[PDB]
Amino acid sequence: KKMSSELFTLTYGALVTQLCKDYENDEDVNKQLDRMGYNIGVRLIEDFLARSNVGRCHDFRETADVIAKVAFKMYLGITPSITNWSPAGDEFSLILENNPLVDFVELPDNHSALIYSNLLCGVLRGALEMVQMAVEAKFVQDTLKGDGVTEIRMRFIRRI
Amino acid sequence: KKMSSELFTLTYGALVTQLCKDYENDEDVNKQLDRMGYNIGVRLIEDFLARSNVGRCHDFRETADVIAKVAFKMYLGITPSITNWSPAGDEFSLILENNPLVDFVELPDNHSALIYSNLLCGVLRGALEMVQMAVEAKFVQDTLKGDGVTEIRMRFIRRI
Ligand SMILES: *C(=O)CCCCCCCCCCCCC
Numbered sequence: 439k440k441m442s443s444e445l446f447t448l449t450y451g452a453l454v455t456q457l458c459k460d461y462e463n464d465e466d467v468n469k470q471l472d473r474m475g476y477n478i479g480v481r482l483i484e485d486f487l488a489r490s491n492v493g494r495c496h497d498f499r500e501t502a503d504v505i506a507k508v509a510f511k512m513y514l515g516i517t518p519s520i521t522n523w524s525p526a527g528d529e530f531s532l533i534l535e536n537n538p539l540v541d542f543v544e545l546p547d548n549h550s551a552l553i554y555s556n557l558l559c560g561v562l563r564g565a566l567e568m569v570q571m572a573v574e575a576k577f578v579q580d581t582l583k584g585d586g587v588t589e590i591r592m593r594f595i596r597r598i
Numbered sequence: 599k600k601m602s603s604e605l606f607t608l609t610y611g612a613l614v615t616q617l618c619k620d621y622e623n624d625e626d627v628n629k630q631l632d633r634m635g636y637n638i639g640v641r642l643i644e645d646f647l648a649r650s651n652v653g654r655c656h657d658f659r660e661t662a663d664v665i666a667k668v669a670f671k672m673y674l675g676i677t678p679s680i681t682n683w684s685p686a687g688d689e690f691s692l693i694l695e696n697n698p699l700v701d702f703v704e705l706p707d708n709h710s711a712l713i714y715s716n717l718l719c720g721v722l723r724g725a726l727e728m729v730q731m732a733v734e735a736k737f738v739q740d741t742l743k744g745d746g747v748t749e750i751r752m753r754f755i756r757r758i
């Protein structure tokens with residue numbers, strides 16, 4: 439059954455806090471969050487494929503639509519918009535007006551290099567690798583850093 | 599907006615995995631999970647009170663009903679049953695047939711002392727402390743350990 443995001447967001451917060459304690463270095467935390475996200479994505483994809491009707495596909499644009507309109511809604515309760523497609527159609531952006539994971543959070547002094555929700559990039563990359571799609575996911579905008587929106591840039595590297 | 603539990607459960611899994619790496623001792627992990635839960639509960643209560651109609655109360659039985667029928671549903675998508683009330687009415691149990699947090703999980707060799715979802719005990723204790731209620735929350739049954747259900751025993755210690 440569906441649930442609100444508050445407990446999830448606070449739990450993610452505990453994770454970030456623990457990593458900051460474990461490494462005392464924002465860059466290390468960013469790296470670990472992405473790694474964990476990757477491992478999560480490799481597992482999460484099995485659940486998604488079982489609960490969706492995409493079957494076996496490899497189309498990048500279809501993948502963008504499914505990620506934004508189905509996966510994000512299913513696992514985070516939000517529907518980001520798909521924007522800025524590259525001429526080649528191998529790059530696009532996910533625009534989030536609101537990011538549940540940053541609720542109740544206030545990025546402190548000197549923590550500017552920290553990419554708080556970096557876990558999501560790993561999830562996207564790990565999940566897509568399992569469907570034979572090598573991609574690059576990265577944050578280019580973050581409301582926690584004063585930006586108007588949160589933006590995840592997606593780039594298709596090659597088929598695996 | 600509401601969301602499924604899979605990403606939350608896998609994220610919690612990453613947290614437990616990290617703690618196991620950080621301490622290499624199940625008892626330490628249990629302790630840290632509970633501590634984190636406590637900190638989460640102290641914050642989560644503010645969100646709950648703002649989104650509920652309980653106002654300022656201190657009744658233990660009412661609290662049990664609200665926890666099981668409102669809070670668990672709101673934050674975890676499940677409604678545990680309330681059972682085994684003590685004669686004094688200062689103790690009760692939360693019975694969970696299904697615990698989202700243990701999905702996709704298989705408690706390994708020698709990890710028997712680990713209380714995988716211990717975070718929840720801390721959440722309950724921390725949240726209740728903020729409403730002037732000192733309590734003890736502990737797992738007495740766990741489906742991960744072969745039990746028929748997951749059981750969280752709640753005991754009212756005193757008003758703060
Ligand atoms: C076929 O060409 C489309 C296949 C799309 C598969 C998308 C899998 C995404 C699941 C994980 C994303 C989680 C985002 C929060």
Ligand SMILES: *C(=O)CCCCCCCCCCCCC
Pocket residue numbers: 642643646652654655656657658660661664665669670673674721722725726729
């Ligand atoms: C008045 O006597 C009842 C007040 C009950 C407050 C309950 C607060 C519970 C919120 C945190 C529990 C989270 C469980 C997943």
